[PDB]
Amino acid sequence: NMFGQIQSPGYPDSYPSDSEVTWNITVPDGFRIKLYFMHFNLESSYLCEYDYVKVETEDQVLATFCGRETTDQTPGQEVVLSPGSFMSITFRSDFSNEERFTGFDAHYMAVDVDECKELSCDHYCHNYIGGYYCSCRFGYILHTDNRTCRVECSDNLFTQRTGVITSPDFPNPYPKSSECLYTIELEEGFMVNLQFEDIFDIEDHPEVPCPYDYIKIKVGPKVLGPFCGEKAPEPISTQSHSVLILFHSDNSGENRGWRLSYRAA
Amino acid sequence: NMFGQIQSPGYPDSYPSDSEVTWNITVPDGFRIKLYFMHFNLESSYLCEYDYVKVETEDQVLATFCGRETTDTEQTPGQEVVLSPGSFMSITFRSDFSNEERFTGFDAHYMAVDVDECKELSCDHYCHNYIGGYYCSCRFGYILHTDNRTCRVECSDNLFTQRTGVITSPDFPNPYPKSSECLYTIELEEGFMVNLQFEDIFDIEDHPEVPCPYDYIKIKVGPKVLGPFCGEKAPEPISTQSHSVLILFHSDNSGENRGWRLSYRAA
Numbered sequence: 001n002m003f004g005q006i007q008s009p010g011y012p013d014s015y016p017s018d019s020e021v022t023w024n025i026t027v028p029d030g031f032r033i034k035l036y037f038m039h040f041n042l043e044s045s046y047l048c049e050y051d052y053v054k055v056e057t058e059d060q061v062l063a064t065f066c067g068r069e070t071t072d073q074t075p076g077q078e079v080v081l082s083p084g085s086f087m088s089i090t091f092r093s094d095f096s097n098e099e100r101f102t103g104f105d106a107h108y109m110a111v112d113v114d115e116c117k118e119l120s121c122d123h124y125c126h127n128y129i130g131g132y133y134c135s136c137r138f139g140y141i142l143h144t145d146n147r148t149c150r151v152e153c154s155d156n157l158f159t160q161r162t163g164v165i166t167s168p169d170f171p172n173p174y175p176k177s178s179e180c181l182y183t184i185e186l187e188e189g190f191m192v193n194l195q196f197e198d199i200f201d202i203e204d205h206p207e208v209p210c211p212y213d214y215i216k217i218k219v220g221p222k223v224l225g226p227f228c229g230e231k232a233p234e235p236i237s238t239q240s241h242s243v244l245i246l247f248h249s250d251n252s253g254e255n256r257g258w259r260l261s262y263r264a265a
Numbered sequence: 266n267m268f269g270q271i272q273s274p275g276y277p278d279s280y281p282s283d284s285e286v287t288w289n290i291t292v293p294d295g296f297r298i299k300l301y302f303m304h305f306n307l308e309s310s311y312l313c314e315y316d317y318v319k320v321e322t323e324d325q326v327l328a329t330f331c332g333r334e335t336t337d338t339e340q341t342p343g344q345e346v347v348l349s350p351g352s353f354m355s356i357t358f359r360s361d362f363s364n365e366e367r368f369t370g371f372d373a374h375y376m377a378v379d380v381d382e383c384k385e386l387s388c389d390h391y392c393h394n395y396i397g398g399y400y401c402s403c404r405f406g407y408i409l410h411t412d413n414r415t416c417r418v419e420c421s422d423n424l425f426t427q428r429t430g431v432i433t434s435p436d437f438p439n440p441y442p443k444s445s446e447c448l449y450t451i452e453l454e455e456g457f458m459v460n461l462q463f464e465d466i467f468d469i470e471d472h473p474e475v476p477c478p479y480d481y482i483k484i485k486v487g488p489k490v491l492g493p494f495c496g497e498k499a500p501e502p503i504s505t506q507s508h509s510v511l512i513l514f515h516s517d518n519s520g521e522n523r524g525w526r527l528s529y530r531a532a
């Protein structure tokens with residue numbers, strides 16, 4: 001079902017009267033139908049109510065043709081493309097073909113849908129015949145949704161008296177679908193003070209507290225947050241030599257993220 | 266296997282030294298292979314002699330890449346697509362013994378691409394392309410021959426009974442249909458004798474050495490066949506002693522010759 005030919009009854013002779021033939025064309029998923037004509041010779045009438053070639057889908061009429069390609073409503077060299085993978089064609093003939101119209105000769109074929117051109121791929125889209133797939137930029141990992149591109153952002157440990165911690169690629173949009181664990185572990189006796197600076201931009205919601213992306217900060221047996229939005233939390237003075245910062249990002253958005261510096265009190 | 270992805274060993278980490286991997290890609294008949302790269306980071310060398318990605322067929326090297334996409338004036342693939350001539354593509358990544366610098370290799374993607382045979386022993390009239398193949402069809406009034414390629418006609422449904430008349434090759438003086446077999450029959454009453462006379466253009470494919478090996482006219486009168494006739498020069502007028510004559514016109518699968526016209530008169 002990648003291709004086919006269709007003719008009116010009797011072709012290349014004049015078609016009979018009182019005839020009605022329907023052809024249903026189905027192609028696999030990821031394909032559309034292309035239809036064109038090499039010969040078209042029908043009765044010409046007002047809005048093709050008498051004799052006609054009707055091209056339609058299951059819920060939509062794509063085209064209706066009648067008349068003669070010579071001096072007339074005809075398809076001409078025009079291609080009829082279906083929106084999806086289905087096309088129905090009906091040739092109808094009324095009660096009298098006294099002029100001996102010779103009908104039509106048509107050809108159809110499956111055409112690949114280019115999904116990349118038509119929940120899209122986060123980074124790269126790759127089209128192929130019958131489908132498509134997504135891939136990611138260097139340094140990113142395709143998520144389990146087969147669509148978004150996450151990163152590994154947990155392989156860290158901050159042990160020095162002062163330091164800087166940011167969302168991945170800050171201040172460029174942070175990676176979607178990621179789960180970053182930043183760990184501060186200073187020397188016993190040191191107490192960590194946290195301080196946000198620069199751009200702060202974490203996707204939020206006007207009514208619901210941080211339903212999408214957020215920072216949580218665990219110090220001792222207690223979690224601070226979640227934090228999101230355009231306004232950073234106020235500086236945080238812990239009484240702890242160790243702090244965990246968890247940054248969660250969902251499958252959507254282009255927010256720029258956050259930066260913090262830490263210092264021992 | 267209409268598509269696939271290929272990476273260097275270790276990707277996205279630096280590739281190991283002394284490694285050699287070949288990927289053979291075969292697609293069905295009527296398809297070609299399209300190959301492109303999303304990341305390319307190799308050692309650079311003269312003719313890519315050290316580290317390289319070599320793209321080839323069974324008898325032809327299509328491309329050889331090396332170097333890093335960052336630095337320019339290089340032998341990297343860039344955004345360029347590599348297209349195989351046929352339905353086979355072989356790819357070899359080679360890394361020599363010297364990997365001082367830590368190059369991260371490559372990320373490649375390939376897919377089958379339909380050959381458009383109509384664009385790229387061809388259809389006489391219409392060619393129709395589809396995914397994985399193609400077919401021919403004919404103009405209105407013609408019939409696709411058993412070769413699935415040339416377009417013949419029915420040209421034998423005739424009978425000339427009038428005292429005078431005109432007979433021509435089909436569509437004269439436009440090119441006559443290939444692969445056809447026309448039978449023209451003149452039948453007059455007993456005692457009439459048919460004279461034949463060619464006129465206007467006469468153009469039947471011929472050969473300089475061999476008598477009419479391609480197309481020809483034969484004319485049967487009584488128990489005798491005249492001809493075969495072909496070429497650019499019509500036979501001289503033919504006076505039969507017969508009230509009935511058969512003209513056979515044969516055309517082969519090739520050529521665009523304009524044909525012939527004759528008038529007849531029953532004496």
Ligand SMILES: *[C@@H]1O[C@H](CO)[C@@H](O)[C@H](O)[C@H]1NC(C)=O
Nearest residue numbers: 400401409410411412413414
């Ligand atoms: C003509 O077409 C048929 C299919 O319709 C094909 O199988 C057959 O082999 C073709 N003839 C030649 C000589 O290829």
Ligand SMILES: [Ca+2]
Nearest residue numbers: 043051096097
């Ligand atoms: Ca009618």
Ligand SMILES: [Ca+2]
Nearest residue numbers: 113128130131
């Ligand atoms: Ca596709």
Ligand SMILES: [Ca+2]
Nearest residue numbers: 203250252253
């Ligand atoms: Ca988000």
Ligand SMILES: [Ca+2]
Nearest residue numbers: 316361363364
């Ligand atoms: Ca090397």
Ligand SMILES: [Ca+2]
Nearest residue numbers: 380395397398
């Ligand atoms: Ca094709």
Ligand SMILES: [Ca+2]
Nearest residue numbers: 470517519520
């Ligand atoms: Ca010829």
